[PDB]
Design a protein around this ligand. Structure first.
Ligand SMILES: N#Cc1ccccc1NC(=O)[C@H](C1CCCCC1)n1c(-c2ccc(Cl)cc2)nc2cc(F)c(F)cc21
Lengths: 230, 11
């Protein structure tokens, strides 16, 4: 049915942590203002991604029960979700309503950022698939939390411990889906289906970055840890 | 080895 006092408490807590992220407007304003070379964009991307991972560790640490997890499992969850979380966030930013013509220019600018064509079409397919769901800020925050607390992640020693942490969050998202879109009973299923399409970007991220039309692919030491790059 | 992730996780 409708959220319990405990669920409402958990939702507002997840929301506050989620909003500690760099504002969508701060990112789209920079892209839309002027066109940049592939070298300038690759640099914008690495700084964007470094800030994202830093803010992600802080959001993750605040997830109920995360700090009670085995420390090696804590790293495995972060390493396993960081790329997925960035693309989900990029999809969110992409689908924010902007003035007439703005989202067409944003799309065109990203399309010519330096990344190869073969990664452009799968990436915009996902962004636009996410857009059709017409997700709320609360749905994005919970889906990110659910992505991080994935028990079926590689190197996870205690899967049941992660299951126990993800289950209450899945219950809240399911309820929000019945509240926000009661005319679409498939909404919760669509969102979870979208998480499988997120997993595909996780396999091609290293290639996606190294295929960028730049002479040198320089990354920060933190990005070399979460991403499989040198 | 992920000592930056480990550092960020434990303060
Ligand atoms: N990284 C990162 C990141 C972290 C938090 C929030 C947004 C992020 N995305 C970004 O900075 C990139 C920029 C980087 C400069 C050149 C143009 C794209 N980006 C990506 C994009 C992420 C990855 C990879 Cl391989 C290709 C593309 N899809 C975006 C969609 C949007 F709508 C949007 F505004 C920005 C977007």
């Amino acid at each position: 049915m409708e959220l319990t006092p405990d669920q409402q408490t958990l939702l507002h807590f997840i929301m506050d942590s989620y909003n500690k992220q760099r504002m969508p407007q701060e990112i789209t304003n920079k892209i839309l203002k002027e066109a940049f070379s592939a070298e300038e964009n690759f640099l914008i991307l690495t700084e964007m991604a470094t800030n994202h991972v830093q803010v992600l560790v802080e959001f993750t640490k605040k997830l109920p029960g995360f700090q009670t997890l085995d420390h090696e499992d804590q790293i495995a969850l972060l390493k396993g979700s960081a790329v997925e979380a960035m693309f989900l966030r990029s999809a969110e930013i992409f689908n924010k309503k902007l003035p007439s013509g703005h989202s067409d220019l944003l799309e065109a600018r990203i399309r010519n950022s330096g990344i190869s064509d073969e990664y452009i079409t799968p990436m915009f397919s996902f962004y636009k698939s996410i857009g059709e769901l017409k997700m709320t800020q609360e749905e994005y925050a919970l889906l990110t939390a659910i992505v991080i607390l994935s028990p079926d992640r590689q190197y996870i020693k205690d899967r049941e411990a992660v299951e126990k942490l993800q289950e209450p969050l899945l219950d809240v998202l399911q309820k929000l889906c019945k509240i926000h879109q009661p005319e679409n009973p498939q909404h919760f299923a669509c969102l979870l289906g979208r998480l499988t399409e997120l997993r595909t970007f996780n396999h091609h991220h290293a290639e996606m970055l190294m295929s960028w039309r730049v002479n040198d692919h320089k990354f920060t030491p933190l990005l070399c840890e979460i991403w499989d790059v040198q | 080895d992920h000592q930056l992730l480990r550092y960020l996780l434990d303060k």
